[PDB]
């Protein structure tokens, strides 16, 4: 189910909140199409393995 | 030749009667044109390091 907002809240928002505390995280982003899936990309500091 | 029990006269109707059965693609999301002609392809991404 899409709903266009429940993807954002309790799925993307909740995931991103936990991501915010990730070690050596430079930033994070998320992309969601109401049709299909959702992606959350965490970009880490350069030099991190 | 799969038989369905009709609900109007009680007759047996083949699946072909109400539908067309063929062999196609599981999904039709993407297509490829190599040099202006149809083809298929896969993108290979290098392993880290």
């Amino acid at each position: 189910g899409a709903t266009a907002k429940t993807i954002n809240d309790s799925v993307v928002t909740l995931i991103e909140r936990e991501l915010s505390g990730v070690k050596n995280l430079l930033y994070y982003s998320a992309t969601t199409d109401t049709s299909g899936t959702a992606e959350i990309t965490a970009t880490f500091k350069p030099g991190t393995d | 030749n799969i038989s369905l029990k009709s609900k109007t006269n009680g007759s047996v109707i083949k699946l072909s009667d109400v539908a067309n059965v063929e062999i196609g693609s599981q999904a039709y999301n993407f297509a490829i044109l190599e040099n202006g002609k149809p083809a298929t392809a896969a993108a290979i991404q290098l392993s880290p390091g």
Partner: protein, 49 residues
């Protein structure tokens, strides 16, 4: 029985699957593709009553 009440709630209050008019595979000459959705979930006390 309580099972009947639960089944009635499940049926009457349901979420309909969205779709897309013009999705692939599509007829030749089609030029417009539009999402389509339907609402089947109750939203008020009177509706549930």
């Amino acid at each position: 029985s309580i099972s009947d009440v639960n089944n009635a709630i499940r049926e009457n209050n349901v979420e309909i699957a969205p779709g897309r008019l013009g999705d692939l595979p599509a007829e030749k000459g089609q030029l417009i593709t539009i999402p389509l959705s339907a609402q089947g979930q109750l939203s008020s006390l009177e509706q549930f009553k």
